[PDB]
Amino acid sequence: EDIIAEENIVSRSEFPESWLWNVEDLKEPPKNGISTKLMNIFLKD
């Protein structure tokens, strides 16, 4: 029938209480003294 086979399903494993323990610098050139930096993070499960 119209159902996902039980082999294909993959379970959400990562269950962290805390994450994003990162330290980054704001080296992007300033605009009115307010630098802007974009990072691509992936949300935990």
Binding region for another protein (CB under 8 A) = 2, 4-5, 8, 10-13, 17-26, 28-30, 33-45
Q: Give the Å distances, CA to CA, from 38 to 10, 11, 28, 29, 41.
A: 30, 30, 10, 13, 10
At its nearest, how many Å lie between another protein and the CB of residue 4? 7
Q: Rounded to the nearest whole angstrom, what is the least distance from the CB of residue 29 to another protein in the complex?
A: 7
Distance in Å, CB of 28 to another protein, minimum:
8
Asked if 14 contacts 42 with a C-beta cutoff of 8 angstroms, the reply is no
